[PDB]
Paper text:
P-glycoprotein (Pgp), a member of the ATP-binding cassette (ABC) superfamily, is one of the most promiscuous drug transporters in nature and is capable of binding and expelling a very large number of substrates from the cell. The structures highlight a high concentration of aromatic residues in the transmembrane α-helices that form the DBP, many of which are directly engaged in contacts with ligands.
The site 1 residues present in the Y303A and Y306A mutants but not the F728A mutant were Tyr303 or Tyr306 or Gln721, Ser725, Phe728 and Val731 owing to a rotation of the ligand to form a site that we designate site 1A in the F728A mutant. The F728A mutation resulted in an ∼75° rotation of the ligand around TM7 at the pivot point of Ala728 to site 1A that is closer to the pseudosymmetric axis and maintains van der Waals contact between the ligand and TM7 [Figs. 1(d) and Fig. 5]. Despite the rotation of the ligand in the F728A mutant structure, there was sufficient space in the DBP to accommodate the binding of another ligand molecule in site 2. Ligands in sites 1A, 2 and 3 generally exhibited greater disorder compared with those in site 1, as shown by higher B factors in refinement and some smearing of the anomalous electron density. We conclude that Phe974 undergoes an induced fit-like disorder-to-order transition to support the binding of BDE-100 in sites 2 and 3, and this residue is therefore important for polyspecific recognition of the BDE-100 ligand when the primary binding site (site 1) is challenged by mutagenesis. All structures were determined in the 3.98–4.17 Å resolution range and adopted the same inward-facing conformation as wild-type Pgp.
Numbering used by the authors: 30 to 626, 689 to 1273
Amino acid sequence: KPAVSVLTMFRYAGWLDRLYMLVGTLAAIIHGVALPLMMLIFGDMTDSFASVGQVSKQSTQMSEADKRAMFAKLEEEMTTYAYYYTGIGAGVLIVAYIQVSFWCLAAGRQIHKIRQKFFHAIMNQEIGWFDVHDVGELNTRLTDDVSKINEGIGDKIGMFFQAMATFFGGFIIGFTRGWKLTLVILAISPVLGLSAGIWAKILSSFTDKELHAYAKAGAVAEEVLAAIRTVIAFGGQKKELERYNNNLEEAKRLGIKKAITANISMGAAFLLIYASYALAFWYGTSLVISKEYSIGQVLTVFFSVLIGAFSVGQASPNIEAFANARGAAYEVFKIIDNKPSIDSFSKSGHKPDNIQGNLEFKNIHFSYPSRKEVQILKGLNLKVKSGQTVALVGNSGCGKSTTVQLMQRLYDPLDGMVSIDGQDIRTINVRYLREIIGVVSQEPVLFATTIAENIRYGREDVTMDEIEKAVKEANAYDFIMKLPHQFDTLVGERGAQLSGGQKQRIAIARALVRNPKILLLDEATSALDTESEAVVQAALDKAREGRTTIVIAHRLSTVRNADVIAGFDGGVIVEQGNHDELMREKGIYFKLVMTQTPPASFWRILKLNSTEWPYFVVGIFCAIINGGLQPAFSVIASKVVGVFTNGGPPETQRQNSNLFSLLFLILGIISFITFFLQGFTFGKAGEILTKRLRYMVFKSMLRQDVSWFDDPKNTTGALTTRLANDAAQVKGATGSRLAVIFQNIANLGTGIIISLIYGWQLTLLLLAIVPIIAIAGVVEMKMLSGQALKDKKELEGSGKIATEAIENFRTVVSLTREQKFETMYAQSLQIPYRNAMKKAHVFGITFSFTQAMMYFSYAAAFRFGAYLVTQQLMTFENVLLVFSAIVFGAMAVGQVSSFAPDYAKATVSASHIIRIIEKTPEIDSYSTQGLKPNMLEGNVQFSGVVFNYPTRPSIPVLQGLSLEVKKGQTLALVGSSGCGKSTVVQLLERFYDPMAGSVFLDGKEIKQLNVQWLRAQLGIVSQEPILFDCSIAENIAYGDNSRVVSYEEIVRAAKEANIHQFIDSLPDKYNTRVGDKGTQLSGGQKQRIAIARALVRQPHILLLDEATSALDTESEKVVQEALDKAREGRTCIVIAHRLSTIQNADLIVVIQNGKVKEHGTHQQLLAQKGIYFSMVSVQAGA
Ligand SMILES: Brc1ccc(Oc2c(Br)cc(Br)cc2Br)c(Br)c1
Ligand SMILES: Brc1ccc(Oc2c(Br)cc(Br)cc2Br)c(Br)c1
């Protein structure tokens, strides 16, 4: 929404840049004007063949006499027009270079200036300007927004003025040569803009319906794949597939309805567009029979108008490129034009010599850019004598850290002044002030250069002697010399990461070369290892003594030797004096001392599509007919102008043009009929395999065991996304792109045959010219992408050192050296600059070549069409036909290179979708094999079970576990932590087979038992019961599948679960909907329902997995009262964390490191004193 003045955007264009654009926009206009003139000459060539075409057939008497006056007229005329043609081709060759080169020259020259001034403005902002802004967005604003500016002031402006030249020059020639046909062509324009307006209303309203259609099926998949362990446990895998298949059945009915309507729309709009043209051209014929226009003049206007009409659309993208570049330049120039109050690039203010370093802080009130929300300093008074070292202590707020911030004048105070020596700090030059102040911060940062270079960031003029003395004076010389490469080592985020105490020592050496008169140490010892702290502290004590120093830290070891100590309380200075005096005061300082002491040939995806042997042959044969039918429109138009040029006696012409225009409209309706078929057939054939694919995938997905659904690769969202994309992508490959790719090869094929058999060597010439200009058009794009990738790699190195400069900004500005990063960034940009200069010459050469190759191709098209061919007996009506048929059939092949990614993006989406079906699990619930025992009573035998989870085979959960529980008794399961309690329930459900050992139920190993039948005797109840969106009667009846559960049967379970108070209180009762879609209820009711579906199964084994986990107050007392009634009649395994409710259990077992540690009845484990005794004691007391 915000934008820029047009002149201010070009403020960096001067002298040559203003001339480059002037000459560039000039030749661009010359480039555009060249095309409608080329069509104007085409009218004069028609009248030359038309006057001879009328007189040659007018004879029917003399023959050798027509070999004289006619051929001489053709000789002088065709040579004149071919001479003019070769001139136009040389014209477009020059202006197209001038157009693109000059504009790319002005663009490259300016963007180089924009980028430097921008980065200069970034480093010029004061710190308070950075505290309110995001540096990451700013650097991306540097590389992205400047790119948008470059796209707007580049050769696009030349293309824009070239297009308006075609538009103006087209309608000028259109108006002058005849004001009638223009107004007739404009009259059909609202119809063409209205038919394409129905498309923007049909696409935008139907693309939501399909995204609404599958969203109902994808909602089923989401709540299923999220509750996968519940449907697996209850075996509803046939139902949840059936529901998904029922929603797929509706999505395909809405998909074929959209295929019917969208193809009716495309054919009808196409028929309205082509009938509009033919009416405007049949109207053109009606004005030649009246001798009002020439047969060649109708072409001259009908083309210059339509060329200039579409020239509007070809200019619209360049308008958006210029406007986006304007608005992109707003926030950029806003930074450049913004002037700071602090500067630091300014050359102003005093530079005192013989600075003695007497600092004082006078009534300083300050607040960080958070402003009126927080005021961290409410008044202040502090002096530090020259030579002295004052230390600042404080409980919190870190107002201690603010004084170091103000001392470098990173901010100016709200009220009050900070005075170095006697002068106010604002009277001294900012850069010189930061140069007389050395800073060592808590987190030290080293830039990605050598040690000597990071030390060289203290002062640019320095020799290895001073570097050596500096690191030796910080006792940092001993440890770097052992490091290889000596001073030439590397540091940074990338490469040679060092100890914290060593990086700080280099920072101390970096600040030591500064030879500052003032020293600021802000928690440099804090957040550092204790051993290396003394090594750095020795350097800090050796760094002072020659300077006045303010030091801030939470280490009260470094504070004793300070001449004065200062305490803060709420931004107010409270206590000050020597260490001993502050202890006698017994105040804030004394208080803190005591406190701290694979693309491949995939045919089988088409073999599954072979379910429909027809519907394809219908579409293909219908598409090939539609392919063979398009050039016949060019054949009609070739003979509408052909018989009109080859007319002779004019009486028969008027009756013939009516016949051709009628046949055209009969060919158009027969084109509509065949287009709708090839669309509907492919559409329906694509929507049905979408159901087959999503059905077989969702079927195979429910086949995999819990081992697969635990994969971090496969989550519910990533599965629903893999489910939708892969099915829609394969539909596109077999869909419209294939019906079109066969319609087009049939379009060129039926066109090349007609053209070849008509003109001998005429077509053979064009078949030598067209492929070359097509290949030359391709190689230009390859060089375009190569230069684009190269320039992206080169400015990346510049923005990389710009990223380093601005992300570590608060450090560099503290060291000044901003001019250093400016020079570094400038040297980095110099390579893309000289690159951008060559880019203009290359871009201009390639564009001019492809334009000239199109215009010279046109001259050879007629100089050969006339002369050698027309001095023979071959005719002009065919040369028009060959031109239209060949060039249109070639532009139809241009759609093959556009639908190419739709094939690869589908084959990759097909690559995954063929494997996701074929993958077979270790435990497949679909296998009908298994024993299915007849004996009812149920035991459970865990024996020597060692189990690790397949996702994390690191820490084992079960190591030699062994349990046994008889029928009808409760097996309590206590554990220190982890799923060692829960893994038992998962292995009994046989979500996994154990690594070693085995687990039995009736004495049979479940590994050889039937998987589905096994889970059919289990009443699983988990922590958070997930209930699908349906009737609570269905969530209850979900406990027993393969049979419809009676209402009184699902009532019995609801009576059993004590949920009947809700089920009768509801208005709908058992038919109420639950799942946070129709109704919402608390977890206590959700659990009771899950208990109901558990015992609707009438299992012989309950499985209660921390059922009272998320519950509270009386809700626990009523749910536990229901669970306690559910057991005592079945085999039961309860791992509930309420050991008070576990006391009345037939056997309590304590799990330890996967092994069973203690076991026995409650009082038995209470008689023993150990883990279980400690478990019951800890939470009964707490
Ligand atoms: Br000769 C000649 C060629 C194309 C003509 O109009 C067009 C044009 Br222009 C493009 C297509 Br596709 C089909 C037809 Br019909 C006319 Br009118 C005359
Ligand atoms: Br230069 C140039 C001129 C006309 C071109 O298209 C044609 C062609 Br090809 C034939 C006829 Br008749 C009219 C037009 Br307009 C092309 Br492509 C390039």
